Amino acid sequence: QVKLVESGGGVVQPGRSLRLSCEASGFIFSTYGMHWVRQAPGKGLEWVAVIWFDGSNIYYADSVKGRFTISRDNSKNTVFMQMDSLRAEDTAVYYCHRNFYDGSGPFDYWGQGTLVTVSS
Amino acid sequence: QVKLVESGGGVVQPGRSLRLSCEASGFIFSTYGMHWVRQAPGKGLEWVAVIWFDGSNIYYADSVKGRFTISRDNSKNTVFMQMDSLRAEDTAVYYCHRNFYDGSGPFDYWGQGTLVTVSS
Amino acid sequence: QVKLVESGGGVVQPGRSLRLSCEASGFIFSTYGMHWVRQAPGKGLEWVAVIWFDGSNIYYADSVKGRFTISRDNSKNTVFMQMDSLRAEDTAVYYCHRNFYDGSGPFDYWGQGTLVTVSSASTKGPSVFPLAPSLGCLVKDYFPEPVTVSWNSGALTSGVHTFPAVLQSSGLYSLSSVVTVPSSSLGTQTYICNVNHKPSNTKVDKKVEP
Amino acid sequence: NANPNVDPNANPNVDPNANPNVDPNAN
Amino acid sequence: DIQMTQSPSTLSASVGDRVTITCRASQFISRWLAWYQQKPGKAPKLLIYKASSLESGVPSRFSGSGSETHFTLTISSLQPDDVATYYCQEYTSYGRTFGQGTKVEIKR
Amino acid sequence: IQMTQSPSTLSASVGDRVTITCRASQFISRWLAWYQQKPGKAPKLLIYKASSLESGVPSRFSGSGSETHFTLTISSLQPDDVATYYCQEYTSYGRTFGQGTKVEIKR
Amino acid sequence: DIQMTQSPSTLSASVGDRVTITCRASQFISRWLAWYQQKPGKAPKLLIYKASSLESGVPSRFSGSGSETHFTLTISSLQPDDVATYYCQEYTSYGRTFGQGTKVEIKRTVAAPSVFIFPPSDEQLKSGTASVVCLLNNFYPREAKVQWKVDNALQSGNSQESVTEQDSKDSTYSLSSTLTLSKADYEKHKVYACEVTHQGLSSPVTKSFNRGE
Known part of the structure; x- marks a missing residue:
């Protein structure tokens, strides 16, 4: 089957950087791309970023800016993301999303979810 | 438990025109369309024309095309039919047909039928 | 009411040619194509070349391409092959297959199968031998397949056994059959053993004695 | 139309069409 | 276009069984076909839809099958309340196309 | 592109007709989808193309609408269908989710 | 070319038991599978198409699941009439490639043979x-x-x-x-x-x- 697993959650000193990475197993990349989606505690979902295979558009949500650089490893089928200049309201749960529609049906393959919190 | 009634008929000399229209009662006109089915005396059935839901998909048979006009008035669940240049071999009993298949068993309803005689 | 039936198929001998026809009855061949699947004698299924309707693009297999030719006919809805340079492992059963998927569900029909054998051995009749009960039958050097064995002119007889034919040495088959019997009532029924061969009509009967 | 998330293709063994007289999503 | 051809209009029976009506088209239509039945003075009534199916209300003894060329209808339990005429129908797009009919009588 | 959902909070008895509105702002074709999330888990896809259906989904759910106005309807409720519904949009590369809609029960 | 393999090659489960067979592809087939069934001495009959739907006439104890390159079939409450061979077909172009085949049987308590007397010739x-x-x-x-x-x-x-x-x-x-x-x-x-x-x-x-x- 196809599974998605992420890592890197934990407490962070506000004003310090953090790195997120999603691991893809059970398939082969270079078809459509991936997404990162997050959910604030008790609120609705919200879109974050997008990365197609190889160099493509890196469209970000307007709420964030170039401080959210996202890149894909050249060797393996992994996606990286850099966190920095965090705020007190950035605590949420980050999922891993990869969706593409074909001529026979849909494919969703949602992630598992990790928690990131900021405090002192 | 819906019912259909057609009004019209009579004796009409060659040429001129006629007015008949089966109004929809007991149900609300939504999706799909309506058809007009002829029936010569002592012969087999024959399809004439079709009107879809709003204003589209209007087709005619080979021997009627270019002579008959069929349209549905706005806000009214009635179908109006007009014919010009009537001739012989066109005396029959006219029905109104509504049939569509979905979900459970089929739904079909047939009108009572009216007689039209063309002569001098 | 589709009744695809195909004809042909017999001893070919190494290095020869043959033709097969799969006539289509009950429908009109105007959309999509007809396949040809081959099943080895006791192994899994396998795929052979296909033809699209009206002489369109044709794709062959990987272990057969270069020696097979396929085409259709216009006046009569039939398909043909013309093979050459057959080896000894091309003996199998050939089916006629056609399917395609539509919004109303699936569509699929299958033929009946013709047995094709490649070897170097003349046709021969079976030689029935008796099995002493101190109950059974036996055949030896019968060719080609298949053969039928019946006991007491019918009935399952509640415990008959028909072992599968085994390719004996040289080039002729062999098989045997046995019948379970209670220790009593010995010889009071006069059991009989009957064989029948279609390619070589022998229909020889044997009576066994204790 | 055409989106970058849907590929354009048609399997030769399937006929893409819908009958206007039958409502889909049924068996 | 599409033209439907039926069995000869003359058919006789003696309250027996195994009466067969054929309906051959001239194009590719897959399983989209329905049969009607008209009493001598009445409106038409549906019998079976999506050939090789059935309808709720009929007293069984009705069946069919076929694929793209030939569709058949059989009774095998002809009582004396089936007399009338049967019409083919095809529905693959907007608009239908009826056959020509086939009358069943009683042999005396 | 700003996307709003009107019925922020709904309630009903055991088996009724419930309607939700996913009126967008800009001009899109039939490119929309709906998700159902139970508490403490990941969402699930329900319908796509604003009219089609997923695999292994009860037939009670049935979307409708076109152009701009989009609606979702349920024939009967049952206690098992209590969750939160989000209406999505997948035109071009980016995807923007809805706002939220919670359905409850009353005894 | 696409190569298909079936993980189990022989099964032996008693009646009223749950069995499973897995078919694994090579590169990619976007949910375009189909499972057949061939009893001895007959022609194969279609069972499931598109890896999820069910053909009319099949009983309700046959079901299967699908993914990109991993498909399974499950039989619940096995009855002593399903002793056959199951294949794994695919169709994505002008041509098909069959699998290998799997046999399912029924198990019971052990027994002993009854050797007979062997007549010479x-x-x-x-x-x-x-x-x-x-x-x-x-x-x-x-x-x-x-x-x-x-x-x-x-x-x-x-x-x-x-x-x-x-x-x-x-x-x-x-x-x-x-x-x-x-x-x-x-x-x-x-x-x-x-x-x-x-x-x-x-x-x-x-x-x-x-x-x-």
Whole structure:
């Protein structure tokens, strides 16, 4: 089957950087791309970023800016993301999303979810 | 438990025109369309024309095309039919047909039928 | 009411040619194509070349391409092959297959199968031998397949056994059959053993004695 | 139309069409 | 276009069984076909839809099958309340196309 | 592109007709989808193309609408269908989710 | 080209049990599978298409799931009528590629064979070379081997064996082994016997010969 697993959650000193990475197993990349989606505690979902295979558009949500650089490893089928200049309201749960529609049906393959919190 | 009634008929000399229209009662006109089915005396059935839901998909048979006009008035669940240049071999009993298949068993309803005689 | 039936198929001998026809009855061949699947004698299924309707693009297999030719006919809805340079492992059963998927569900029909054998051995009749009960039958050097064995002119007889034919040495088959019997009532029924061969009509009967 | 998330293709063994007289999503 | 051809209009029976009506088209239509039945003075009534199916209300003894060329209808339990005429129908797009009919009588 | 959902909070008895509105702002074709999330888990896809259906989904759910106005309807409720519904949009590369809609029960 | 493999090649589960078979693709098939079924002596019949839908006429105990390159089939409450071979077809262009096949059977408690008396041959002697038969009957399980000792000697590469299909009445099998020897060889020697082995038997058994009657 196809599974998605992420890592890197934990407490962070506000004003310090953090790195997120999603691991893809059970398939082969270079078809459509991936997404990162997050959910604030008790609120609705919200879109974050997008990365197609190889160099493509890196469209970000307007709420964030170039401080959210996202890149894909050249060797393996992994996606990286850099966190920095965090705020007190950035605590949420980050999922891993990869969706593409074909001529026979849909494919969703949602992630598992990790928690990131900021405090002192 | 819906019912259909057609009004019209009579004796009409060659040429001129006629007015008949089966109004929809007991149900609300939504999706799909309506058809007009002829029936010569002592012969087999024959399809004439079709009107879809709003204003589209209007087709005619080979021997009627270019002579008959069929349209549905706005806000009214009635179908109006007009014919010009009537001739012989066109005396029959006219029905109104509504049939569509979905979900459970089929739904079909047939009108009572009216007689039209063309002569001098 | 589709009744695809195909004809042909017999001893070919190494290095020869043959033709097969799969006539289509009950429908009109105007959309999509007809396949040809081959099943080895006791192994899994396998795929052979296909033809699209009206002489369109044709794709062959990987272990057969270069020696097979396929085409259709216009006046009569039939398909043909013309093979050459057959080896000894091309003996199998050939089916006629056609399917395609539509919004109303699936569509699929299958033929009946013709047995094709490649070897170097003349046709021969079976030689029935008796099995002493101190109950059974036996055949030896019968060719080609298949053969039928019946006991007491019918009935399952509640415990008959028909072992599968085994390719004996040289080039002729062999098989045997046995019948379970209670220790009593010995010889009071006069059991009989009957064989029948279609390619070589022998229909020889044997009576066994204790 | 055409989106970058849907590929354009048609399997030769399937006929893409819908009958206007039958409502889909049924068996 | 599409033209439907039926069995000869003359058919006789003696309250027996195994009466067969054929309906051959001239194009590719897959399983989209329905049969009607008209009493001598009445409106038409549906019998079976999506050939090789059935309808709720009929007293069984009705069946069919076929694929793209030939569709058949059989009774095998002809009582004396089936007399009338049967019409083919095809529905693959907007608009239908009826056959020509086939009358069943009683042999005396 | 700003996307709003009107019925922020709904309630009903055991088996009724419930309607939700996913009126967008800009001009899109039939490119929309709906998700159902139970508490403490990941969402699930329900319908796509604003009219089609997923695999292994009860037939009670049935979307409708076109152009701009989009609606979702349920024939009967049952206690098992209590969750939160989000209406999505997948035109071009980016995807923007809805706002939220919670359905409850009353005894 | 796409290569398909089936993880299990033989199954043995009792009635009313849950069984599963997995078909694995090579590169990519976007949910375009189909499962067949072939009873012996017949033509295969379609069971499931598009890896999720069910063909009309199939009972309600057949179901399966699909993904990109991993498909499974599950049978709940197995009945003693589904002893056949299941294939795994694919269709994504002008052509198909079948799988390998899987056999499912029914299990039961162990049993023991009933060795019979083995008659020599005389009409075979008159016609030429002779042959004799080692026969078993109604044993379980299938796994067993046979060997012969002609004057306590072992023979290599001279015998062939055949086994019948599983019986539909009591779920048992049968065995039969034969040997071909020349006319001259049978004239000499005096003693030959059949040696059998079975995991269900406590100890191997011996059956002697009878010459002249």
